[PDB]
Amino acid sequence: DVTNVLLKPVLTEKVYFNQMGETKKYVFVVNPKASKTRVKLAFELVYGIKPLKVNTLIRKPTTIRGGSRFPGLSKLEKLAVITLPKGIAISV
Amino acid sequence: PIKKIISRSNSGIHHSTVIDYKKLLTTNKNKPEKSLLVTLKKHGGRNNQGKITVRHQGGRNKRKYRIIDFKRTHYDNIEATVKSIEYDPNRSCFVSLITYANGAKSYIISPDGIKVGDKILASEHPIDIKPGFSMPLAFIPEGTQVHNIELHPKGGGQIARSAGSYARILGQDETGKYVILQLLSGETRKFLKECRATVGVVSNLDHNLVVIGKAGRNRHRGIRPTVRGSAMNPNDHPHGGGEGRSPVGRDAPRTPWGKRHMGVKTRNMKKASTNLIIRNRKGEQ
Amino acid sequence: MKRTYQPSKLKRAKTHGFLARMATASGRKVLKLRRKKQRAQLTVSSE
Amino acid sequence: SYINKPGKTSAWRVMTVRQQVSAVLAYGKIETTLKKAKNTQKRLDKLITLAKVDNFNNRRQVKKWLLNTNLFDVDQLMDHLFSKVAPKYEKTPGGYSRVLKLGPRRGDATEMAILQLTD
RNA sequence: AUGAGCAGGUUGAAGGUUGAGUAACAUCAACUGGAGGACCGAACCGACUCUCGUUGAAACGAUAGCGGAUGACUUGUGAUU
RNA sequence: UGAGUAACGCUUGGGAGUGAGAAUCUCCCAAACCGAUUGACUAAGGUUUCCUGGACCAGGGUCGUCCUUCCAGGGUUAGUCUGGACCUAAGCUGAGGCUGAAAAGCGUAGGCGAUGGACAACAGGUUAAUAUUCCUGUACUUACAGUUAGACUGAUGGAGUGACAAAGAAGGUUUUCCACCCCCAUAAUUGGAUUUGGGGAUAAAUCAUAAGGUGGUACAAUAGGCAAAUCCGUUGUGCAUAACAUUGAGUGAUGAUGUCGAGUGAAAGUAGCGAAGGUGGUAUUAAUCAUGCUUUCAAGAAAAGCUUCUAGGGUUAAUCUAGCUGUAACCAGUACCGAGAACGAACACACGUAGUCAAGGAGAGGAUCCUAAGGUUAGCGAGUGAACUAUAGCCAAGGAACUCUGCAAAUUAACCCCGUAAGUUAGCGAGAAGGGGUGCUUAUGUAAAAGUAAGCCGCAGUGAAGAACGAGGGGGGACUGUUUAACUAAAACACAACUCUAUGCCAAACCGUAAGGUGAUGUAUAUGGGGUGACACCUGCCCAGUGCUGGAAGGU
Ligand SMILES: [Mg+2]
Ligand SMILES: [Mg+2]
Ligand SMILES: [Mg+2]
Ligand SMILES: [Mg+2]
Ligand SMILES: [Mg+2]
Ligand SMILES: [Mg+2]
Ligand SMILES: [Mg+2]
Ligand SMILES: [Mg+2]
Ligand SMILES: [Mg+2]
């Protein structure tokens, strides 16, 4: 409920391609230590719409900046898609 | 009795033999009763440290220990009845599945002669002498074949329970207690008169006449190759080394370790049981 | 031919892992030595 | 060295000749190495001179050499040949193709040449 | 400890049944049965020979042959000395 | 310096296009190899190597507009898949404790530990990248609350089941297959065609059916199952031949007015459109029933789980079963490669790496040759065709004269048919040796085919590809096996068997200081150790010396 489990929404062409359907599957990146029940409860508290389904995945850190004399590591983040009832939509 | 196996597999010749298992057993199908089976974990010659303490022991098949009642204590003056005679992989002899009147199944070591439907009893009062009966040695008359003897009273039949073994009664001692026994292999001992036993020789008398033909059969039986000393190197064995088929060098043959081996007495004389011995397969004490 | 390093991350973790090196006194001693040398990859637990 | 490429076996040589002459019939010009055009020209001339009769036997003989191309399949290439290429050469005794030399390639300095046929 | 694998095709034991035979045995003939650290031979395992290679393709290999190939077999995973 | 020398570590040709630059990039057409695999799905392993756009410093044994390289952006979606929240095997760890200068070692209750057990989801579609996860269609499972009907519920404990070896054979069942039929396109300039080519399908799930398989059955007594049991076990009685219980491949219907579908095809072979989507047999094929059955001995996991039993509870009720309404279903993996370029080999290294799918022709076959589905252009080329090297092909006459030796190479080779000696442990020798036939057509063959007859052709008829060369005598080891990874595979080691020796259980021997453990949950028909090494016949003399055992007087 602290709403420290909704870090950011991501807007990619795949996300839009899913948006021009009818379920309007909104997606977010969430606190990796959180869970699907916490994510859906937070979504209910922040918008007021009870979600239909939640699916999650996490992107493992990888080598970034290649060979540049100072290579680093990427960010480990969890993405949580949030389906909705067919006849509803909301902004972000 | 043994049944000769004719291989006719044209790669060498082997005159192997095997106990008949057909006219001696009953219900030759391997269908043991469930309630008294516990699996044996094959130590494989090794030890809790994981090292090898006993050489050439490993590779046996997977067995299931048949819980055998040696003590014969919880059931007294309650009649039983032999149900079948199976082949027990763990030991050389044959096991009978008996059934007491109350309805508690158990395994005992089958004396030779018994068949399905016979009736046996075990108690502490003077009873009959038919094979399978059990009673303290103080009541058994002299001369009868006896097995499943134990050293300490209420201890369970450690002594003389192998296939085709027995022991002859030889009366009592002059002290009144310590009834004298003529154990197999010449040794004569003294047993307390309150020790239990069972009359009748042990069945499967022809386990000695078997002739294992193939090496693989022996290996499946749990035995591994034994490398002689003369094949060894001068390290790892006192008989090793030598530039080809050397004879034993030292004064006397040696063990893999330095201990003297041939013809050397090794029993510990300072055991309380020494007073119980009359002859030790060669001579007095 | 079959070389001498067939990888299996489970075996690596159970053998050289941190908790494996925290099981015996000698493991604690070698951990102390590695802290003294300040090695960044202290154990195989860190990639 | 014991194992090696199959190399330029007789079958590979004659199949390359087949492919090149088929391509010449299809298009009319080829940019290939000079010392391959100088060999292909023989079979090219033989096929051109053999096709000035249009009997079924000559078409059967021609079948032994042609290979289908993106522009023309084998049967359509036969029809093209025996219908318009051979009539163009009904009075020239031999020498139906010319092999002129280009500049060397930057890759291998090999001496590319054009195998071309015209009256 | 726990699983897995052995393309295919041969040979036809013991035992049993039937009949003969025997006073009863033994033994003989036909049918059944399908055994073997059995056979031939792919995957698999191994390394007996020649050549090549020896700053090699390779810190032990390649073509060609070669031996075993239902077992004292081969192999994955886990544990231990 | 060696030196612009060896080497560049399994293969092509052409058209068009881009671009400054083209053998090496893109597209197109062929071509050649792989095709029991370079084809497809994955475990482990790697950790972004995946997709799109851009770049060609560096890396690519050459070039580069291009790359598994570099830069920018993007991509993995699970109540049902793999693992955890369930269960234990080997084993690990281990409160107390035992043991040990100290550190520590062993070990009990407990707790972990899959390579195994139990457990609910299928077909299709969709993107550049994911799909039993997303979407459509259809379902299933478990909790939780309420409601309705019925019923007394029964554990942390007991019992049953769970629950298992190897080999082999037969049978049911659809399949493969064949034949017929249906549908679609196809009618051919090179001589003759009145055909040729392709396709003929559907899941989980619910209901009914179900060939079969498994195994006495019901009643009455109970002195056993830490405690009680109606359960199990035990004992009698009648019925027994099928009844009962249990399980069961497949079949039928819905699922499906759907999807797929040969092809047709516009803006791409793509969107779309898309016909038939069957009959009978089978002396062949696989897969299931099957954790079924038979035989043999080397006698073939545990726990959880499921059913049941009472205990204990409930009674002014709980709890369970069934239906209906409603709510919920957690965490981690999900990309890609999976190998002659992403892993282990320092490499874009000819090497190694578990499992699964495994088409056609001849073929017993996954052997062999050419191919189907599908994939590739072995990341230096072009010339010449000298010596010389390697790998092939062949060689007249002779046929081991070579040589340390027939090393190497050469002959035979498949199926069918005659024919097979000495010796022997009577099993073998033995595919012994030595010979004959195979092609095609017609006829006859039977159920197919082998077989048979007639005829024809060639030098040749498993016309190619894949198939044992034997004979005789001797030494050794009885035999199958194992052995010096990376110079020695044998006469060496082991082996079944023989003998001797030790050991009566807290056994001898062994690891450890010791607890403790192996020996062994075994008991002299057993176990440890030395020596010989099937089998057949034998194993002679010497106890002076040494070793061992025994000895009781004396000396030291
Ligand atoms: Mg040069
Ligand atoms: Mg020079
Ligand atoms: Mg030179
Ligand atoms: Mg060179
Ligand atoms: Mg490879
Ligand atoms: Mg593999
Ligand atoms: Mg094939
Ligand atoms: Mg092949
Ligand atoms: Mg010897």
Do you know the residue count of chain A? 92
Residues D55, D86: Cα–Cα separation, whole Å: 13
CA B86, CA B24: separation in Å to the nearest integer?
Answer: 9
Helical residues (DSSP H) of chain D, grouped into ranges: 10-26, 34-50, 56-63, 74-80
What distance in angstroms lies between residue D3's CA and the mean position of ligand 5's atoms?
A: 17
The 3-state DSSP class for residue B134 equals strand
Q: Which nucleotide minimizes the distance between its C1' and the CA of C11?
A: E78
Distance from the CA of C10 to the center of ligand 6, in angstroms?
A: 20
Q: Any residues with CB less than 8 A from the CB of D90 and at least 6 apart, and which?
A: D52
Give the distance, in angstroms, between residue B76 CA and nucleotide F222 C1': 19
Q: Which structural domain, as residue segments, surrounds residue D65?
A: 1-119
Residue spans of beta strands (DSSP E) within B22-170: 37-39, 64-66, 80-87, 94-99, 105-109, 119-120, 134-136, 146-147, 168-169
Ligand 7 centre and the CA of B172: distance in Å?
85
C-alpha D98/C-alpha D115 separation (Å) is: 6
Total domains in chain D come to 1
Rounded-to-5 percentages of helix, strand, coil across chain D: 50, 15, 35
Beta pairing, strands A54-59 & A63-64: unpaired
DSSP B191-227: E-TT-EEEES-BS-TTSTT-----HHHHHHTTB----
Give the nucleotide nearest to B60 (CA→C1').
F298
CA distance B279 to D65: 108
| Contact in structure between B166 and B203 (CB atoms under 8 Å) | no
The answer to whether D35 touches D20, Cβ cutoff 8 Å, is no
Work out if B36's Cβ lies within 7 angstroms of strand F.
no
Residue by residue, DSSP assigns chain C as: ---S----HHHHHHHHSHHHHTSSHHHHHHHHHHHHHT-SS-STT--
Task: Indicate the Cα dihedral angle B240, B241, B245, B251, nearest 10°.
Answer: -60
Work out the angle at residue C2's Cα, subtended by the Cα atoms of residues C1 and C3, and round it to the nearest 5 degrees: 110
- Which residues neighbour B262 within 8 Å (Cβ) at sequence distance 6 or greater? B252, B253
Q: What is the DSSP letter of B232?
A: S
Strand E-proximal residues of B, range 225-254, CB below 7 A, are 225
Q: Is B227:B191 a contact under the CB 8 Å cutoff?
A: no
- The alpha carbon of residue B94 and the mean position of all alpha carbons in its chain are separated, in whole angstroms, by 11
CB-count burial class (<10 Å; 0-12, 13-18, 19+) for B200: buried
User: What is the 8-class DSSP label of residue B127?
Assistant: -
Q: Could you say which residues 108-147 of protein chain B have a Cβ atom less than 7 A away from any atom in strand F?
A: none
Task: Identify whether the C-beta of residue B137 lies closer than 8 Å to the C-beta of residue B191.
Answer: yes
The experimental method, as deposited, was cryo-EM
Q: Which two tokens stand for residue A37?
A: 């029940």
Q: Is the Cα torsion angle B20, B24, B29, B31 positive or negative in sign?
A: negative
| Count of the separate structural domains present in chain A | 1
Query: What is the 8-class DSSP label of residue D84?
Result: I
The answer to whether the beta carbon of residue D109 comes closer than 7 angstroms to any atom of strand F is yes
Nucleotide minimizing C1' to CA distance for residue B265: F502
- Please report how many Cα atoms fall inside a 13 Å half-sphere around the Cα of residue B43, on the Cβ side: 13
Q: Is the CB of B74 under 7 A from strand F?
A: no
Using CA atoms, how far residue A41 sits from A5, A21, A23, A44, A47, in Å, is: 10, 24, 19, 5, 10
Give the residue carrying structure tokens 């090999």. D110
Q: Is any atom of nucleic acid chain F found less than 7 Å from the CB of residue A8?
A: no
Helices (H), B25-135: none
Task: Please list the alpha-helical segments (H only) found in chain B.
Answer: 215-220
Give the whole-angstrom CA distance, residue B140 versus residue B127: 9
- Residue range(s) defining the domain that contains residue A83: 1-92
**What is the Å distance from ligand 4's center to D5 Cα?**
16
Return the closest-CA partner of residue D47 out of D12, D100, D85.
Answer: D85
What is the signed CA dihedral for B106, B110, B111, B113, rounded to 10 degrees?
Answer: 110
Ligand located closest to D1 CA:
4
> Does the CB of B168 sit below 7 A from strand E?
no
Cα distances from D88 to residues B239, D13, D52, in angstroms, run 103, 29, 10
